[PDB]
Amino acid sequence: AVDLYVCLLCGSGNDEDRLLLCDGCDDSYHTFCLIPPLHDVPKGDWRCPKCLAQE
Amino acid sequence: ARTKQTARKS
Ligand SMILES: [Zn+2]
Ligand SMILES: [Zn+2]
Known part of the structure; x- marks a missing residue:
């Protein structure tokens, strides 16, 4: 589920904004x-x- | 960037 994605650092993913x-x-x-x-x-x-570190 | 939201009901 795309909504399942939550801030990797927090994991609350509730801050929609x-x-x-x-x-x-x-x-x-x-x-x-x-x-x-x-x-x-x-x-x-x-x-x-x-992703920037890649370059 | 794409916005994502998460909420739970109970
Ligand atoms: Zn966070
Ligand atoms: Zn990245």
């Missing part, structure tokens, strides 16, 4: 559980630091 799913690699994360909280959840065009 802050839970961002990384398509590159990371599964689910919160804007605050990542790096300095982002202004908002990107419109589907973003990646987490784990």
Whole structure:
């Protein structure tokens, strides 16, 4: 289930507004559980630091 | 990024 995806760091995945799913690699994360909280959840065009480390 | 939500009923 896609909803099953929860912030890997927390696991509550209840913050609908802050839970961002990384398509590159990371599964689910919160804007605050990542790096300095982002202004908002990107419109589907973003990646987490784990995928960036690849490059 | 895609938004995801999670809630439980009880
Ligand atoms: Zn979190
Ligand atoms: Zn990633």
